[PDB]
């Protein structure tokens, strides 16, 4: 895959992204689909979003001890990012639905890896 030289020091907001494979620039397949508007717009629009993620991921990364709600995370978020609520509600949703946040403060349904789990399937 992408090989180069990076070195050994950590990154800002940016850093949100590397640690998942997708492009911090644009958008994915996934992105595109959730955000049709987003895709579909201004180079500013695009990144406007592209923006707001990244961003929620670091203030997760950073007390992901507590759920982030989609105030908080719009409170601390700089417009005009912040600017569109809208926005803000799609994007912190997108993340928490894909297990991208919000997944280690609270019980919410969930499997895990249990000793061979079935409460006792018959078919038959």
């Given at each position: ?64 001890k507590i759920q ?37 403060i ?19």
């Amino acid at each position: 895959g992408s090989s180069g030289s990076s070195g050994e020091e950590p990154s800002g907001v940016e850093g949100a992204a590397f640690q998942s494979r997708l492009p911090h620039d644009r958008m994915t397949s996934q992105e595109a689909a959730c955000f049709p508007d987003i895709i579909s717009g201004p180079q500013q629009t695009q990144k406007v979003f592209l923006f707001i993620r990244n961003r929620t991921l670091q203030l997760w990364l950073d007390n992901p001890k507590i759920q982030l709600t989609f105030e908080a995370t719009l409170q601390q978020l700089e417009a005009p990012y912040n600017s569109d609520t809208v926005l803000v509600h799609r994007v912190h949703s997108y993340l928490e639905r894909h297990g991208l946040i919000n997944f280690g403060i609270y019980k919410r349904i969930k499997p895990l890896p249990t000793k061979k789990t079935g409460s006792g399937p018959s078919s038959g």
